């Protein structure tokens, strides 16, 4: 939902 890109 938020920026969950690692």
């Amino acid at each position, epitope marked *: *939902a*938020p*920026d*969950t*890109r*690692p």
Partner: single-chain antibody
Framework: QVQLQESGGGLVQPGGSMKLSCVAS????????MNWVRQSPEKGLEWVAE??????????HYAESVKGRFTISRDDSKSSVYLQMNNLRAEDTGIYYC????????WGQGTTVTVSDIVVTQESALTTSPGETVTLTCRSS?????????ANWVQEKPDHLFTGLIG???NRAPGVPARFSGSLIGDKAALTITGAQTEDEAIYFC?????????FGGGTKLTVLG
């Protein structure tokens, strides 16, 4: 080493306008959302605004207290993010930080602006010793913290120096020591230091996500004695 460098703060009159900048290096800026977060002595850490990617049509969201007054924007060809602040109030006084990545790994040094509901609760203070296991907790007034709150933990050391430790509940940020861990325990988010070290004396903040905004906790002062 990633760097974020803010600029444009100062000393302004109520009703005034100001634009802050932040330039980034060392990571693919255009692939990550960016945020502005401010720290004030009275209101603590406060999330201000986010801006998403080009592929999201640069969607933006704002804290209710700045809506219609502040505008966040980015220029991916200059690896920069901006905050345009209109109709400034005394309440807007603070240190302003640009921050992002998984979700608050990287923080700039901050730029000072002087103008002249969900509550997230943390332990005010905790005291430990080197080599102890210490657990900090983060509770929400809404009910249980779950993995859909994407709990982050950030550390503040002198002087107003921030580094992200944990995002997405339990993912360590790159280069964060192994002794730091994130968990969910009895419907609270939790940060555990397994074998505390003297250098871990600091203020620890949690942040929780609620659909389209972040709420920061009040911080815990951790003292490491002996």
């Amino acid at each position: 080493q990633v760097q974020l460098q803010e600029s444009g703060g100062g000393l302004v009159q109520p009703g005034g306008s100001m634009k802050l900048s932040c330039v980034a290096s060392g990571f693919t800026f255009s692939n990550y959302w960016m945020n502005w977060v401010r720290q004030s002595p009275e209101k603590g850490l406060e999330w201000v605004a986010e801006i998403r990617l080009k592929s999201n049509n640069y969607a933006t969201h704002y804290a209710e207290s700045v809506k219609g007054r502040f505008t966040i924007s980015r220029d991916d060809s200059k690896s920069s993010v901006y905050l345009q602040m209109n109709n400034l109030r005394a309440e807007d006084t603070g240190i302003y930080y640009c921050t992002g990545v998984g979700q608050f790994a990287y923080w700039g040094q901050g730029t000072t602006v002087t103008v002249s509901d969900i509550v997230v609760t943390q332990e005010s203070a905790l005291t430990t010793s080197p080599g102890e296991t210490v657990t900090l907790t983060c509770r929400s007034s809404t009910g249980a913290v779950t993995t859909s709150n994407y709990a982050n933990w950030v550390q503040e050391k002198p002087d107003h120096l921030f580094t992200g430790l944990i995002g997405g509940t339990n993912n360590r940020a790159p280069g964060v020591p192994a002794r730091f861990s994130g968990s969910l325990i009895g419907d609270k988010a939790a940060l555990t230091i397994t074998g505390a070290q003297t250098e871990d004396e600091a203020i620890y903040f949690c942040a929780l996500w609620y659909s389209n905004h972040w709420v920061f906790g009040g911080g815990t002062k951790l003292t490491v004695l002996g």
